[PDB]
Design a protein around this nucleic acid. Structure first.
Length: 358
RNA sequence: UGUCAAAAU
């Protein structure tokens, strides 16, 4: 069998819907754009829009379409962009066609992929951001294309309700993370700070709603990302710590999901905010006794122990002395209630750590 | 002793 056989029999669909036939088409498809067999196969692919869009939706057919994307020049890409734009929203939600869309985002010329990105502006973006398939399309656009192709997403997520729904979703939290990273990893090389204004418009909702976001089963991760980020998002980290966590550390160390946020905050914060957090913990049966004997706050106590142990090895010796004070206070309270703590592993681990350091 | 943590052959 050869390709002239499938061109003469008009059987492109019948091999591309088969596994072995599509692998034959992929292995023998000519890569040079001026080959006649290349052009005849391309015409048979794109001459009927319904056939093309059904081949994009196929379990085995899509791959051949993806190979046609890898070999394509600008004239072929214009036709492909028009056919994809006619059904882009359902193509993004499909298990097979979304991979064609993602490869198109990587491989098309930037104005063509910009056109496809801006086609989605008036669709249902929450539904697209929370789908198992379309989330990856949104992330591919954000991490691939320049920002002017997707600032409508920053405007969309500037609304508070939209942010909460996407951030609290299993998949949309990943979308929020990728957008914050892309807008923060850059702006450093920029001279006019265009991306950090967009990042401030995005992070205003996060700081405005971060108590509910930190208490959530999926949005907590997003709240941990900012705090764990570093100097790129350090201002927003410090805003979250001074506004949300302070005067609420006793409550959220006891919650199932927000205790991870409190733990990450003890792990990654400046000394002033750490000192204010230790002030809140040691100055409310008081708060440290509650957190030693709690199913979630015990891990917060362990994190305080670890950030005092690694904290003592510091250049400024005043901060190191305060770290020693805090660790000595924790050590004294644990040796006061060691008898009961030994009953549960919650305490065995805490003691083992306090034993490691004498 | 604590989290549902990302879609094809």
């Amino acid at each position: 069998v050869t390709l002239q056989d499938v061109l003469a029999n008009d059987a492109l669909v019948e091999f591309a819907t088969d596994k072995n036939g599509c692998r034959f088409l992929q292995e023998h498809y000519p890569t040079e754009n001026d080959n006649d067999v290349h052009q005849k196969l391309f015409r048979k692919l794109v001459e009927d829009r319904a056939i093309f869009l059904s081949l994009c939706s196929n379990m085995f057919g899509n791959f051949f379409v993806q190979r046609v994307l890898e070999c394509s020049n600008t004239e072929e890409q214009e036709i492909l962009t028009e056919h994809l734009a006619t059904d882009l929203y359902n193509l993004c939600l499909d298990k097979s066609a979304c991979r064609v869309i993602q490869l198109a985002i990587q491989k098309l010329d930037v104005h063509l992929a910009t056109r496809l990105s801006l086609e989605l502006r008036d669709t249902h973006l929450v539904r697209l951001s929370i789908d198992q398939n379309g989330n990856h399309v949104i992330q591919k656009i954000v991490k691939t294309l320049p920002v002017s192709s997707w600032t409508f997403l920053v405007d969309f997520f500037a609304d508070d309700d939209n942010l909460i729904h996407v951030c609290q979703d299993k998949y949309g939290c990943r979308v929020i993370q990728s957008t914050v990273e892309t807008l923060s990893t850059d702006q450093y090389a920029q001279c006019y700070q265009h991306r950090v204004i967009l990042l401030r418009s995005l992070m205003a909702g996060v700081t405005r709603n971060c108590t509910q976001l930190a208490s959530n089963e999926f949005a907590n991760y997003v709240v941990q990302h900012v705090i764990k980020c570093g100097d790129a998002l350090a201002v927003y980290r410090d805003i979250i710590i001074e506004q949300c966590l302070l005067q609420n550390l006793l409550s959220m160390s006891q919650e199932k999901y927000a205790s991870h946020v409190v733990e990450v905050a003890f792990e990654c914060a400046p000394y002033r905010l750490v000192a204010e957090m230790m002030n809140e913990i040691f100055e409310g049966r008081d708060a440290l006794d509650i957190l030693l004997f709690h199913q979630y706050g015990n891990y917060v106590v362990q994190q305080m122990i670890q950030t005092c142990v690694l904290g003592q090895n510091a250049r400024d010796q005043k901060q190191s002395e305060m770290y020693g004070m805090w660790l000595e206070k924790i050590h004294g309270r644990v040796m006061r209630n060691a008898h009961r703590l030994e009953r549960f592993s919650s305490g065995k681990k805490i003691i083992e750590a306090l034993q490691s350091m004498s």
